[PDB]
Design a protein around this ligand. Structure first.
Ligand SMILES: NC(=O)c1ccc[n+]([C@@H]2O[C@H](COP(=O)([O-])OP(=O)(O)OC[C@H]3O[C@@H](n4cnc5c(N)ncnc54)[C@H](O)[C@@H]3O)[C@@H](O)[C@H]2O)c1
Ligand SMILES: NC(=O)c1ccc[n+]([C@@H]2O[C@H](COP(=O)([O-])OP(=O)(O)OC[C@H]3O[C@@H](n4cnc5c(N)ncnc54)[C@H](O)[C@@H]3O)[C@@H](O)[C@H]2O)c1
Ligand SMILES: NC(=O)c1ccc[n+]([C@@H]2O[C@H](COP(=O)([O-])OP(=O)(O)OC[C@H]3O[C@@H](n4cnc5c(N)ncnc54)[C@H](O)[C@@H]3O)[C@@H](O)[C@H]2O)c1
Ligand SMILES: NC(=O)c1ccc[n+]([C@@H]2O[C@H](COP(=O)([O-])OP(=O)(O)OC[C@H]3O[C@@H](n4cnc5c(N)ncnc54)[C@H](O)[C@@H]3O)[C@@H](O)[C@H]2O)c1
Ligand SMILES: O=C(c1ccc(F)c(O)c1)c1cccc(-c2ccc(O)c(O)c2)n1
Ligand SMILES: O=C(c1ccc(F)c(O)c1)c1cccc(-c2ccc(O)c(O)c2)n1
Ligand SMILES: O=C(c1ccc(F)c(O)c1)c1cccc(-c2ccc(O)c(O)c2)n1
Ligand SMILES: O=C(c1ccc(F)c(O)c1)c1cccc(-c2ccc(O)c(O)c2)n1
Ligand code: NA
Ligand code: NA
Ligand code: NA
Ligand code: NA
Lengths: 255, 255, 255, 255
């Protein structure tokens, strides 16, 4: 009932954090459009959840995004909230191992895809006095080792959130972001499998938080529903969902 | 239903932000103990709200706080959440107009009262895996003019929140704070009446936010219920409820 | 004498903040390579300053940057510090007036040009235990109105600074950034001339700081010399040179 | 020569960080008044350094501080900079092991002593357009385990710095703070000796920084001289001198 009658688009909603956000909004009473470039997860989610439908869309293709917005309006008549969750973390890479072309490609997904959907949705969000929620990362704020391009893209997302909150405030459209820490998702599982010692890498990821565990997609989802439905005086904020990983001293050097 | 079966203590809950927090938790299904040093507002609130009871308590008197905790346990059998909201903003004061004794007295209310209740409640919060919510202020983070002692007390509250989150994480007790901006409350009304031009001071307070209005106590209350009931991976965070006042450039000099 | 015997590259050093940084390092005893895509300012600066030489280089062209580094080594035998100052602020633009292609182009200058020079210089900086200084902006941290692409590029620069500081710490190479506020430069003068009321826009820019004035290029230059020569325990920091613009409340809404 | 003709007061200047700051200002050309409550270190420093003199003063005693200011003026004719460095870190203490009276006493030293000297010096700093430098701590910003009162006092110092910067900006008096991380000092040595395994505790303190070492008092001193002599557009800033300890993920839980 908390967000009943509202219409929500979630990008990258087929698995992981995105799927947790989809479930949270459905459980809140909203109708949800699942955007994803992969069919398998999103199509099953649509079969599972009444009130969720899947639309195939690669957020780096402007025509895909144009079609995503116009199909949402044609099928549901309004748009109240856009959750820009689609993104990717490459394998760990030393700075000298990165390239400018890989950096550009990551900017297309993590940053320009967020920019494009937000721009095309804003005319409808103004009509509904809706809101924008970007999924950024704690490492945009504190940095990360072996991830120069990834960290740069999330620093941009968090900053862009504040700029757009300023521009859209006169229209009553709020723009906020969530900065998760280590959340246990298929990407976390995939990247750990490439590590020399997968079990050790997962152990270290759980101990990076004072709480002693990683986060869950449903916990990012609850934060998103809060920002959409009950945070009417919040705009341009960065909501940390990190288990306290940024607090206090810890071992940062190995020698 | 979101916080049903839980028991919550709110200090300074008789009016203003505190009363908005009380109402939010009652509406969530919790039983609420209203702490306040003044009887008038809190006693009426208890008559109004089933599930809220008023206990007279000055948070700067350690024996008052000891009695507040033991009465809560005797009457309700558990304690799940402590909201440290009691505090005060003195009239604007130039630095040379402040005194060390006024500074100490403000520290007793805004900082040591929060410390004392939290310490006495933590044995019961550990049993329930409960949580602590401190009401700090945006001006602890960005400063404020003519308010050296006030700003110092809120900088301490925000920092203390993070230290205690680290100590209590091994026990599953989360410690978070909310940093409101300009919220329209009886204190805001009282301080504006002392100004040379009350209507001008209220106009300026509304324009300090890109959203063009002040916040409401119910909006701080919704943030508190989120932190208590649905933010299980959030500890040591500072949740801004400010209407965007910290964003972008604005006129800060007068000459 | 503070940085005698050292070799410094400053991008965009032909005018504005960049030229102030060049002068500061020359006055500290360093030899300075002035990089710029425009010949007029940088060539005169080389004639004016013993110990500074001008190399024509567009930082968005990878071959230009490759040649800049190899010419620096061929002519001076070492490289101790890279100051990534080249960048641009477009005229104010509403979000719906921006384009993805303009956003990409601004990313090439403000972000990828910084990335490219840093990458090509790091082998020589490791030999000298040198350091990197990026010129970011306060608006990366607090946002700005009518500047979504600009703000995003500076959020990325600040975040990238921290990521690279982590990767290069094992080699003793420090990576820091400076975040200036309103600095009076030819770009500030040019953008103000496009405003409906140039004199009013300059007045407002001076009042945005509690200090009541804009900053000067020489003040950014002194901060850069500090980071290069005397901040041996500073890495991944963001040094604010803003006149206090981020402090306290100010008028942010117009209605 | 950088700060020649200027007069500087440094509290707690007899050993540790304070003594490093004293040496840095003497080497810059300034005359320095060493304030300390202990005679041994400060008296030897006065014998060692031409241009430094020792004045016995406990910053928690208001009459001591009154005498410190009037003796500085009587002997040197002006006052340009006050460095509030005097402070203390108690042994690690669980929250339930702390007391309100110990908390109050620590507030007297770390916070109210800074407030008192600053207030009494400001009339002379306005005449000279001088500046204030408070020595805070990184743990005011990120928290620390087993240090609730200490962390609270430093959160207050950092916030107070910004409030006072706002009040004093119309008079051209700048107010800044330095937030050091782990600096190797006699207090660090003393606290490590109380640990179950002193050598292990020192090893862990060095590895808490990506740079792999602790900081030195002379490095805090260089930051202070920068803020006094060359940071004319810097007010209300928090200058981190931490070796990057706040950057990236590290092990924060033990189980
Ligand atoms: N996992 C973490 O610990 C963590 C931490 C902080 C932030 N994040 C962020 O959260 C978001 C989700 O991460 P995750 O761990 O759930 O990842 P994930 O890989 O498990 O899921 C991402 C989903 O997005 C989809 N997607 C990828 N590219 C797309 C495109 N071009 N168009 C549309 N959909 C696309 C994928 O198909 C997939 O379903 C990302 O933005 C990530 O950076 C993750
Ligand atoms: N109003 C704002 O704009 C604003 C902004 C940021 C933070 N805050 C903070 O929010 C909190 C509430 O502010 P408000 O505007 O609602 O104030 P308020 O004056 O309207 O209400 C405060 C309540 O606390 C009670 N109280 C005061 N001293 C007490 C004591 N010793 N023991 C118990 N109760 C005591 C008062 O009797 C009153 O009912 C404070 O901590 C304040 O600093 C307020
Ligand atoms: N002016 C301010 O208030 C302000 C505030 C914060 C940050 N900054 C940043 O400071 C930096 C300098 O700003 P400014 O005000 O001095 O600008 P400016 O326009 O006055 O000077 C910039 C210089 O860089 C050169 N340049 C531009 N593109 C280049 C390229 N592709 N390759 C090489 N050189 C190039 C220009 O030719 C010019 O000489 C920028 O990164 C800007 O974003 C400026
Ligand atoms: N050592 C660190 O790693 C570290 C890190 C961050 C911040 N700091 C801060 O730096 C400052 C100095 O720390 P340190 O490690 O050099 O400590 P230290 O104990 O080695 O030296 C402190 C000095 O201050 C003096 N002092 C103490 N109480 C005083 C009083 N009432 N009046 C006058 N002088 C007094 C002592 O006699 C001593 O000479 C403190 O404010 C501390 O909190 C230290
Ligand atoms: O996607 C990941 C992630 C982890 C934390 C984040 F905050 C984030 O935004 C993304 C992730 C998952 C598994 C391993 C890693 C990782 C491990 C070691 C690294 O050096 C690295 O750069 C990334 N990152
Ligand atoms: O209580 C107030 C307040 C306002 C904003 C806050 F963030 C906060 O924590 C408290 C308040 C209410 C009305 C006026 C003022 C105020 C106005 C001008 C001043 O110079 C000042 O220090 C305070 N403060
Ligand atoms: O280049 C400018 C600038 C100004 C401040 C900054 F922090 C920064 O990084 C850049 C500048 C100069 C003159 C006017 C403006 C400006 C004015 C109104 C605007 O809406 C805007 O987006 C920019 N910016
Ligand atoms: O004084 C210390 C200190 C250390 C770091 C700081 F940022 C700071 O402001 C002060 C210090 C020195 C030696 C050990 C410790 C320490 C070790 C374990 C602890 O649990 C603790 O609270 C403090 N602190
Ligand atoms: Na469905
Ligand atoms: Na009742
Ligand atoms: Na020359
Ligand atoms: Na002497």
């Amino acid at each position: 009932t908390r967000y009943a009658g509202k219409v929500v688009v979630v990008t990258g909603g087929g698995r992981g954090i995105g799927a947790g956000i989809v479930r949270a909004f459905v459980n809140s009473g909203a109708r949800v459009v699942i955007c994803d470039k992969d069919e398998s997860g999103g199509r099953a989610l649509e079969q599972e959840l009444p009130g969720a439908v899947f639309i195939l869309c690669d957020v780096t293709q402007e025509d895909d995004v144009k079609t995503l917005v116009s199909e949402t309006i044609r099928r549901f008549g309004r748009l109240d909230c856009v959750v820009n969750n689609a993104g990717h973390h490459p394998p760990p890479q030393r700075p000298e191992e990165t390239s400018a072309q890989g950096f550009r490609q990551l900017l297309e997904l993590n940053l320009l895809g967020t920019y494009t959907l937000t721009k095309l949705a804003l005319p409808y969000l103004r009509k509904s006095q809706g809101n924008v929620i970007n999924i950024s990362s704690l490492v945009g704020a504190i940095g990360q080792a072996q991830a120069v391009p990834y960290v740069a893209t999330k620093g941009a997302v968090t900053a862009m959130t504040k700029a757009l909150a300023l521009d859209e405030s006169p229209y009553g459209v709020r723009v906020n972001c969530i900065s998760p820490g280590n959340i246990w998702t298929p990407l976390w599982e995939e990247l750990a499998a490439l590590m020399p010692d997968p079990r050790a890498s997962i152990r270290e990821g759980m101990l990076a938080q004072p709480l002693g565990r990683m986060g869950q997609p449903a916990e990012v989802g609850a934060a998103a529903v809060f920002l959409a439905s009950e945070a009417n005086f919040c705009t341009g904020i960065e909501l940390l969902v990190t288990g306290g990983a940024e607090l206090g001293y810890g071992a940062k050097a190995s020698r």
